[PDB]
């Protein structure tokens, strides 16, 4: 603990509920780019940016 | 750039107006009687302002990829006006110039098919280096106008000037269209004509040199 190189590591003992979102409603578009190849691209973004 | 819809007395209107929605919208639509000012109907979507009647509904902005409505039911005489639609939309810039207006019209009396007429340039004018065509329509309702000017076989396109119908005192509106040319064009094509389509039917009258 004096060294300060090393982290300090934590453990809770009561959970903290974390809520995590993407809220951009995107879209797959799979173009293919080769024979038995698919390269997967995001697609027109439907919705609030 | 205008946009007519017709409408039974006492049925349901629809009105499009503006481009397709990218983001969550605050669409507003406005009144503007003939002659009188744009007074507002609906601000946004569906929330009305003191003194609207419920009849008078707008699309929600909360969908995506459609385009803002206005829904009329039962419509009476005093609601017909031409509605303009200002979009806020999230995904789109500020938009300073309101969308093309419709232009909703109750029936109000029996479909006429237009009454039109065409004089040649009158032979005064020759000496003064100028050649006008003069096509009058009349009798006519609703009022919509539809210039088609054919000199034999293909038409001009420039050189075309009309106005708005207006009403004389009767259903009927009032249209005139005109055409200004030259000396040298007149005697250049065999034969010019003026037609009129009104609601799906053309009227045709044509005209020859002597
Ligand atoms: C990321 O970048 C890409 C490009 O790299 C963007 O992709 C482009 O997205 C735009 C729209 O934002 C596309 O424009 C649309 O193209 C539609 C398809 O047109 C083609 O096919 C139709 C028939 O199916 C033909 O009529 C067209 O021919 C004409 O257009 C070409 C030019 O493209 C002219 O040169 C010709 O002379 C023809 O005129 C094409 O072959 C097209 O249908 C669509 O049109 C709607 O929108 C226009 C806007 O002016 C209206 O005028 C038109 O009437 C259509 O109106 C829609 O909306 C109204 C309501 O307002 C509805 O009532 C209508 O029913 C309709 O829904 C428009 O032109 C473009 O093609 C596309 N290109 C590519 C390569 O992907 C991404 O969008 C962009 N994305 C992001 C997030 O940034
Ligand atoms: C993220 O964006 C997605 C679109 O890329 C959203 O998916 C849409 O989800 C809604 C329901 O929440 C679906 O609506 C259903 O559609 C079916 C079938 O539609 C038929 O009728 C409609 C006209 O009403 C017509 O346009 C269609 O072509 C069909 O003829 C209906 O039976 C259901 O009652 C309901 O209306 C959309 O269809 C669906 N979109 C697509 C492209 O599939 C998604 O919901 C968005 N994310 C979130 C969280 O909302
Ligand atoms: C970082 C820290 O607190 N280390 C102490 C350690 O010094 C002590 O000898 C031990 C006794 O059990 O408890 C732990």
New binding site residues.
């Given amino acids: 603990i004096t060294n300060n190189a090393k982290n300090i590591l934590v453990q809770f003992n009561t959970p903290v509920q974390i809520n995590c979102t993407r809220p951009n409603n995107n879209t797959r578009k799979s173009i293919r780019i080769g024979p038995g190849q698919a390269f997967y691209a995001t697609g027109?973004?439907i919705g609030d940016i | 750039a205008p946009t007519f819809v017709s409408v039974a007395p006492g049925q349901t209107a629809r009105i499009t107006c503006?481009?397709?929605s990218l983001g969550s919208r605050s669409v507003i639509w406005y009144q503007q009687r003939p002659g009188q000012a744009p007074s507002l109907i609906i601000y946004n979507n569906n929330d009305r302002p003191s003194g609207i009647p419920d009849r008078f509904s707008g699309s929600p902005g909360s969908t995506f990829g459609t385009?803002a409505t206005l829904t009329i039911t039962s419509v009476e005489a005093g609601d017909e006006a031409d509605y303009y639609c200002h979009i806020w939309d999230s995904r789109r810039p500020t938009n300073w110039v309101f969308g093309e207006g419709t232009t909703l019209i109750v029936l109000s009396q029996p479909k006429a098919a237009p009454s039109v007429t065409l004089f040649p340039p009158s032979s005064e004018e020759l000496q003064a280096n100028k050649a006008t065509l003069v096509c009058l329509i009349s009798d006519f309702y609703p009022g919509a106008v539809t210039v088609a000017w054919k000199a034999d076989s293909s038409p001009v396109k420039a050189g075309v000037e009309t106005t708005t119908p207006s009403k004389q005192s009767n259903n009927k509106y009032a249209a005139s269209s005109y055409l200004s040319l030259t000396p040298e064009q007149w005697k250049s094509h065999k034969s010019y004509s003026c037609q009129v389509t009104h609601e799906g039917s053309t009227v045709e009258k044509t005209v020859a040199p002597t």
């Fill in positions: 027109d973004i | 503006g481009e397709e385009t």
